[PDB]
Amino acid sequence: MDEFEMIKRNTSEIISEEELREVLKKDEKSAHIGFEPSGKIHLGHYLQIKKMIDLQNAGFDIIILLADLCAYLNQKGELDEIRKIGDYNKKVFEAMGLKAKYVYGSEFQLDKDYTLNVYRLALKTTLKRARRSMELIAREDENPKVAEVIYPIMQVNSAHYRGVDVAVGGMEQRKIHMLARELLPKKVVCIHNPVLTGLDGEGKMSSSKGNFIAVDDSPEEIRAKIKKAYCPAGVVEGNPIMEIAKYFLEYPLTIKRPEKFGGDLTVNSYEELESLFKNKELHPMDLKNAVAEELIKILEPIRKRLLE
Amino acid sequence: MDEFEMIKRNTSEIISEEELREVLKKDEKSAHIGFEPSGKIHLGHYLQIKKMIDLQNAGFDIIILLADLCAYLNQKGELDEIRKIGDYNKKVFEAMGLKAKYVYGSEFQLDKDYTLNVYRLALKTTLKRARRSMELIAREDENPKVAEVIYPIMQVNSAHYRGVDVAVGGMEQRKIHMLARELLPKKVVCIHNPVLTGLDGEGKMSSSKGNFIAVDDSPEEIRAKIKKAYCPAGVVEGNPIMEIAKYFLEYPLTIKRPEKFGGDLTVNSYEELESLFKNKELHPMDLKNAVAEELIKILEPIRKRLLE
Numbered sequence: 001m002d003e004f005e006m007i008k009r010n011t012s013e014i015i016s017e018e019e020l021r022e023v024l025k026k027d028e029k030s031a032h033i034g035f036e037p038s039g040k041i042h043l044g045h046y047l048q049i050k051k052m053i054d055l056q057n058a059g060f061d062i063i064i065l066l067a068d069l070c071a072y073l074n075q076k077g078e079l080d081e082i083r084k085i086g087d088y089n090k091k092v093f094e095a096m097g098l099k100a101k102y103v104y105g106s107e108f109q110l111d112k113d114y115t116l117n118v119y120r121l122a123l124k125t126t127l128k129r130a131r132r133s134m135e136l137i138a139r140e141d142e143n144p145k146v147a148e149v150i151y152p153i154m155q156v157n158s159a160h161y162r163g164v165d166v167a168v169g170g171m172e173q174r175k176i177h178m179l180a181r182e183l184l185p186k187k188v189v190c191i192h193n194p195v196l197t198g199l200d201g202e203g204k205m206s207s208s209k210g211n212f213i214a215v216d217d218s219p220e221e222i223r224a225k226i227k228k229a230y231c232p233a234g235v236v237e238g239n240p241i242m243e244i245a246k247y248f249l250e251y252p253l254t255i256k257r258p259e260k261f262g263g264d265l266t267v268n269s270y271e272e273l274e275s276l277f278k279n280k281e282l283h284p285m286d287l288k289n290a291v292a293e294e295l296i297k298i299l300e301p302i303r304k305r306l307l308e
Numbered sequence: 309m310d311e312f313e314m315i316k317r318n319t320s321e322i323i324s325e326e327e328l329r330e331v332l333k334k335d336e337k338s339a340h341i342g343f344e345p346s347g348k349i350h351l352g353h354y355l356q357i358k359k360m361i362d363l364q365n366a367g368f369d370i371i372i373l374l375a376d377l378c379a380y381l382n383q384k385g386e387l388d389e390i391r392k393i394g395d396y397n398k399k400v401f402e403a404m405g406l407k408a409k410y411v412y413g414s415e416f417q418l419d420k421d422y423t424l425n426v427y428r429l430a431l432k433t434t435l436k437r438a439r440r441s442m443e444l445i446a447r448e449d450e451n452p453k454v455a456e457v458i459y460p461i462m463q464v465n466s467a468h469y470r471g472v473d474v475a476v477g478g479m480e481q482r483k484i485h486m487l488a489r490e491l492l493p494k495k496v497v498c499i500h501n502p503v504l505t506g507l508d509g510e511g512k513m514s515s516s517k518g519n520f521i522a523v524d525d526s527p528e529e530i531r532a533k534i535k536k537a538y539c540p541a542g543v544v545e546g547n548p549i550m551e552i553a554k555y556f557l558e559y560p561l562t563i564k565r566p567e568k569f570g571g572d573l574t575v576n577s578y579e580e581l582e583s584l585f586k587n588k589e590l591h592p593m594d595l596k597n598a599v600a601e602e603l604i605k606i607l608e609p610i611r612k613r614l615l616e
């Protein structure tokens with residue numbers, strides 16, 4: 001398994017694989033990811049931090065951008081309050097075991113040279129393109145603000161300005177990233193992680209939608225959220241419990257079941273779990289019990305560091 | 309005639325008259341106008357500079373904003389080239405007899421505090437409103453850029469930032485000004501000048517449309533432009549020659565005519581010229597001859613200073 005294959009594991013796409021391979025040869029290489037600060041850090045965040053850890057293990061210097069100014073532009077509140085949530089997020093990311101440097105967008109995004117660049121990019125970016133790039137990111141607003149279209153060019157210049165080789169984000173960032181690869185002289189390698197389904201199955205997981213498991217949820221809370229989650233027998237597509245099994249659990253996985261329902265089941269890969277679930281050899285209740293118990297153990301060290 | 313009435317003369321609107329009156333009482337008061345730098349300075353510019361002179365005579369400190377960064381956002385070229393045209397414009401404005409201070413937008417519009425203000429305003433300004441405010445200003449573009457909607461909030465913050473009591477501009481600026489009066493804590497008094505008709509009568513006069521008389525046009529050039537201008541008998545509405553008579557000429561005005569066509573005509577006011585023209589007592593050819601000759605004399609001192 002290449003460093004390349006370790007990095008590629010469980011990503012949705014890498015733009016491009018050829019470019020990443022060229023990057024991997026260098027002694028010194030950096031990757032960054034930006035997050036609008038979030039009151040709760042959930043499995044979606046953890047999925048991406050896990051990927052940053054993969055990159056770190058492959059010798060990348062990791063930068064976490066606490067995106068206070070973008071969050072401000074996306075109507076998340078006042079900068080001072082946003083920064084405080086950013087600081088909390090840093091502590092959570094540290095509790096996850098990430099070795100990284102942290103920067104606040106506003107530390108450099110209001111510099112004269114940065115701003116001049118933003119305006120230069122604004123001349124090359126159509127309103128239609130800017131709005132399209134924000135469809136999965138923009139806060140819902142019946143009267144869309146000028147701030148909405150400044151946000152994507154702020155993010156485009158961010159990669160350029162700080163000289164990152166690799167930008168990581170969820171699939172929802174991909175249009176902004178495509179714009180960056182088009183507009184900037186140096187092409188940034190983009191690694192996109194899948195977007196987790198919300199627990200009720202009705203859309204994507206999000207801090208604003210209350211459809212997530214937070215990394216510091218209590219065990220009792222995790223069990224309840226999983227008990228109630230969308231998880232139709234035989235259905236893997238859009239099944240958040242199966243997603244958790246794929247992205248977070250380790251294998252071989254032992255699934256405990258009463259003897260009357262077939263007894264304990266040892267599963268050597270997610271792929272084999274998927275076949276058992278599609279073939280209805282594994283019931284949603286037994287899948288859920290195992291996912292809840294293993295996820296609790298996975299998250300325990302993080303919750304404990306945050307509780308201590 | 310009040311200072312108020314001197315200021316009001318030949319304006320399209322003042323927002324608001326009550327506010328201007330409060331302003332007039334102060335010992336210290338300033339007014340500014342901004343211009344995207346223009347390769348040619350035309351009668352539209354001169355009309356507004358004349359109004360700045362009125363304000364100066366009423367005891368206002370005048371600031372001319374050479375709007376290099378707005379011009380950049382509105383696709384007028386590179387900043388360095390734009391600034392050079394700005395410097396030329398300053399020399400023309402000085403040749404007009406204006407006593408003012410001149411500043412380049414970019415001297416202060418890229419400051420961290422300015423930019424933070426721009427982003428705060430971007431949160432309060434809808435895209436729909438920003439685009440509407442730019443309809444008569446925005447460079448024609450089949451694929452409108454993000455830069456187009458940054459421009460109006462740049463101009464909104466300009467008035468606020470430099471603490472002007474009064475902003476002057478053409479009617480085309482009125483939506484941006486309305487936005488400023490809505491968004492800022494201090495209401496700026498806005499004085500709007502009429503927009504001159506193009507020489508061919510087919511739209512408004514503009515540097516980009518080649519339908520103007522420039523202040524340094526040669527006498528021969530002025531005569532030719534006027535000879536060819538739209539000027540229907542009896543029609544005052546949208547008649548650029550009648551506009552020049554109203555906004556630039558002094559009265560009493562003597563109109564020279566051959567005896568066979570009624571002989572020389574002395575006109576004591578624009579209002580009386582308008583009645584004679586509507587009643588068809590004054591032929592377009594005779595009106596044009598007088599307007600051309602008087603406009604040449606009006607502009608001679610400006611052209612001469614620029615030629616020297």
Ligand SMILES: N[C@@H](Cc1ccc(O)c([N+](=O)[O-])c1)C(=O)O
Nearest residue numbers: 034035036067070105154155158
């Ligand atoms: N768009 C990201 C945040 C972000 C990512 C990368 C960035 O470079 C920046 N930025 O420049 O402020 C911001 C999000 O949805 O959470």
Ligand SMILES: N[C@@H](Cc1ccc(O)c([N+](=O)[O-])c1)C(=O)O
Nearest residue numbers: 342343344375378413462463466
């Ligand atoms: N909109 C003006 C230029 C302008 C006027 C006033 C201003 O404050 C600024 N500005 O802030 O750059 C720019 C024009 O059409 O020529």
Ligand code: NA
Nearest residue numbers: 025026027028
């Ligand atoms: Na080496």
Ligand code: NA
Nearest residue numbers: 333334335336
């Ligand atoms: Na006094």
